[PDB]
Amino acid sequence: KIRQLPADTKDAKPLLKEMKRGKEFHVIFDCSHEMAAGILKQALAMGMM
Amino acid sequence: THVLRFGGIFEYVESGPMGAEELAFRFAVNTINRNRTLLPNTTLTYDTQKINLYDSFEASKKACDQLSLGVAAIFGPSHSSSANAVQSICNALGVPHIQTRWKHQVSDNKDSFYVSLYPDFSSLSRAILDLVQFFKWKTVTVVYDDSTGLIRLQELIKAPSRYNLRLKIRQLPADTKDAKPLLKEMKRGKEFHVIFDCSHEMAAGILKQALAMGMMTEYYHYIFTTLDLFALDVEPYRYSGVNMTGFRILNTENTQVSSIIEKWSMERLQAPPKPDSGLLDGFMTTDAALMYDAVHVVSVAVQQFPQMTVSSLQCNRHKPWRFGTRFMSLIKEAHWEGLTGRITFNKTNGLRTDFDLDVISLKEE
Amino acid sequence: LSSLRMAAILDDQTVCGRGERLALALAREQINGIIEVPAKARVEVDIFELQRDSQYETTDTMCQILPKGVVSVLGPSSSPASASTVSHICGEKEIPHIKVGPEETPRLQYLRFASVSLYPSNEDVSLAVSRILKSFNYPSASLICAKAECLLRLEELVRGFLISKETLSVRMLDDSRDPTPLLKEIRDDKVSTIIIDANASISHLVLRKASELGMTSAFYKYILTTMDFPILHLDGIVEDSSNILGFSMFNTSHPFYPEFVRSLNMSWRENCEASTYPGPALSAALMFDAVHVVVSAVRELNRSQEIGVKPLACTSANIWPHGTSLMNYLRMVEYDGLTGRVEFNSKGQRTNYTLRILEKSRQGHREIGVWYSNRTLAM
Numbered sequence: 001k002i003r004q005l006p007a008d009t010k011d012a013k014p015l016l017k018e019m020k021r022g023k024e025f026h027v028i029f030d031c032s033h034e035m036a037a038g039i040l041k042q043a044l045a046m047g048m049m
Numbered sequence: 050t051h052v053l054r055f056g057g058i059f060e061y062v063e064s065g066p067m068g069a070e071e072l073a074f075r076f077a078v079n080t081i082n083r084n085r086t087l088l089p090n091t092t093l094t095y096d097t098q099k100i101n102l103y104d105s106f107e108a109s110k111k112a113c114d115q116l117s118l119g120v121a122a123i124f125g126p127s128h129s130s131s132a133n134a135v136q137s138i139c140n141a142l143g144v145p146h147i148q149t150r151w152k153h154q155v156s157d158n159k160d161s162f163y164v165s166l167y168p169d170f171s172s173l174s175r176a177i178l179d180l181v182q183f184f185k186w187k188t189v190t191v192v193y194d195d196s197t198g199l200i201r202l203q204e205l206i207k208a209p210s211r212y213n214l215r216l217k218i219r220q221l222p223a224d225t226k227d228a229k230p231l232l233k234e235m236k237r238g239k240e241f242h243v244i245f246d247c248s249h250e251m252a253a254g255i256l257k258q259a260l261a262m263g264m265m266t267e268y269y270h271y272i273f274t275t276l277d278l279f280a281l282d283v284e285p286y287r288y289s290g291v292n293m294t295g296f297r298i299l300n301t302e303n304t305q306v307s308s309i310i311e312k313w314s315m316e317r318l319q320a321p322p323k324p325d326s327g328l329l330d331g332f333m334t335t336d337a338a339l340m341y342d343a344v345h346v347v348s349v350a351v352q353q354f355p356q357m358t359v360s361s362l363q364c365n366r367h368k369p370w371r372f373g374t375r376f377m378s379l380i381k382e383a384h385w386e387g388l389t390g391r392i393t394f395n396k397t398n399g400l401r402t403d404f405d406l407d408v409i410s411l412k413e414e
Numbered sequence: 415l416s417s418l419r420m421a422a423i424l425d426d427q428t429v430c431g432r433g434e435r436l437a438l439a440l441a442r443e444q445i446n447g448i449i450e451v452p453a454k455a456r457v458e459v460d461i462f463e464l465q466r467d468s469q470y471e472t473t474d475t476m477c478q479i480l481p482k483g484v485v486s487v488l489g490p491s492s493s494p495a496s497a498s499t500v501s502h503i504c505g506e507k508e509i510p511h512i513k514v515g516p517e518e519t520p521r522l523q524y525l526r527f528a529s530v531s532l533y534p535s536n537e538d539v540s541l542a543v544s545r546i547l548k549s550f551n552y553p554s555a556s557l558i559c560a561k562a563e564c565l566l567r568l569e570e571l572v573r574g575f576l577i578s579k580e581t582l583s584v585r586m587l588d589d590s591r592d593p594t595p596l597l598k599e600i601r602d603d604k605v606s607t608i609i610i611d612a613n614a615s616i617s618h619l620v621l622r623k624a625s626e627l628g629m630t631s632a633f634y635k636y637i638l639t640t641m642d643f644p645i646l647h648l649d650g651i652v653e654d655s656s657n658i659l660g661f662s663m664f665n666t667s668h669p670f671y672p673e674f675v676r677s678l679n680m681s682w683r684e685n686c687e688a689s690t691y692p693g694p695a696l697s698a699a700l701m702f703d704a705v706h707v708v709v710s711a712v713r714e715l716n717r718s719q720e721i722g723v724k725p726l727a728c729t730s731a732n733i734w735p736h737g738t739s740l741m742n743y744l745r746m747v748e749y750d751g752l753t754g755r756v757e758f759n760s761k762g763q764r765t766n767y768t769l770r771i772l773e774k775s776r777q778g779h780r781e782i783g784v785w786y787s788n789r790t791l792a793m
Contacts, residue, residue: 013288047266047289103525105502106728109473129520130498137469153520155495156561157467198520198566203586206565206572210556210583210599218573365474 010038016046051091056115056123061101064320072318073337077344088352105134112138119359129153136163142362143373145380149339162377164399166339170201172402178208188215190240194247195223226254232262242270249277253327265291280332293411298389306388342387350379418712421479422461423489429685436681437698441705467493476503483723486510486708491697494518501529508737514700518563528741532700535763540571545791553606559586560612579603593620597627607635614642625651645692652774661769665754699752711744
């Protein structure tokens, strides 16, 4: 299932909330690593880590 | 015209020149003097000493010194051993003692001229019992800091014999703030529901360690007895869905409450906690709040009682205070609607077990 | 100096008591009587009867004691409130407090510690109850605490069990002191072992009420923890079916135990024979043994150094000059005596101590073996 990152921001909280709601547990993230660190902090404070 | 002095025996604080409790006591006497509705013809003077921590002989020396100066009450201290030492000096010498933090009471100890103001952990733990049943928890795990005995959880330990609850008690590493082996045992055991019973400075650390150990998911539900839960900061975990549910005694709905809290905070009186700990600024913690109430409940009883004045009282060579029974009764029968709700005392033991709690919980906001 | 004078504190009464005055005196008589060469410093034991368990009274007594320039302050025997004030005063003054009763204070380790406790530690009895229950294949026990200070005394026992109706549940005595509803709950839930904990008299009351509720039969195992267990004598509560078990540390085989029990037998009837004398309660021995402890360590320090006592006033902070040294010498002392081996760990507790278990019989004791301090339960 393909989901786009927010190109508006790094605040991926809506997207991560859908990812959790849908029980999606395995995610292939393709992003440059600054965005990877941002998404991992916002994944931690979203209880997905 | 009337002078009347209180004593205070407060701890040595490396947080600064004045401890939070001490600042409140100093701020309280001033606030209760500048009010005109209360103690109009009199005033308060306050002789506050400090002690080192765990210094019962020095604390008893201090109490002998203050009572030799002439006091009508001795407030503080906080740590249980120094608390009990001052209690016994006062009980024989007749001068009312008005503690603030929960001490462990010895069940022999027949002493009566003491009144406590922390809401007593028997009834508070009974509240936690009524909460566990509401969430229909069957398995709970109580984690207690060793400094406090399991005695304040005695209703939680008697509780499995009268319901179906599979309690399991574990001890927080007391020497450390880093409880990762404990937390890993808690997770391998799938102990989803935990009743932490620790001071909130420990509770901020435990919650932070939990997030790292990934126990902050939408599974776990952590109930906390620490009545400073609202003053903890929860923005690192608000969206996680961990269902923390704690108790909270401060009447932050009321406007006189929120303006007194504002005065205490915006007067920079407190010492700013750093953002490493995950704790917050500008909050009057429960400890200090009870003290602000304590100066008042005693001062209400003073205002009701015109003719007592202090008298100099040597230790071991002087009689019970000649006004101790009268002043103590009036302190025990005071209904004062303070910052922490109503203040009234279970007249048997001078404790406080009637108090209107607010359960707070972690909603996504 | 010329007399190693030390200070008793006896909470006990002088009439029909644990007789501690007499035991401390007997020990004094035995030591200043055993003539050695060269003629040494004498032993005098100054004795101070304390009325109540109030810290205020104790501070008065200790301020009445420090001028006497005493090497240590024995006791107080059964006053767990007064114990923390003595220990606090003498840890201030650098003078050892040889505690002889338990400690039901929380006893923070960061607290000023210069106290050696001849009384089995609360963790250590807890492990003994844990390991007797591991011998009985972990039945669904239920603990009957007298006060709430049970829970601080048997703390590690509680933590090491999933507290429920099925492994271990705590009941406590109510204010009524009538255990019959509790035993009715215990009989309800099919609770095989009951771990009664109290002082010795509330122990008799739980058992007598239990014997009448018909709960003393073949099925029930009662692991009493009240470490005064040699003085409990039961009539109509003890059957050969009955399985009450206590612990007792007396090394009866030590030569003095027969004679001492004769001396404590004589000075029991004279004060009062209103009840028959139920045997030497434990605190007499721990005091008798402890006077030997402190005399032995002080005597060693009196050799490698020379120790002077100073009129010490609780006002002035003058500290006994040799105190932490005597502490060090106390923590390595070993005396084999009425209370068994007396050796102390670094924490100031007691280790290498033998709690000889007893399972009661229709008249008295059947040593069913020992729970050692280290090599746990070689029964």
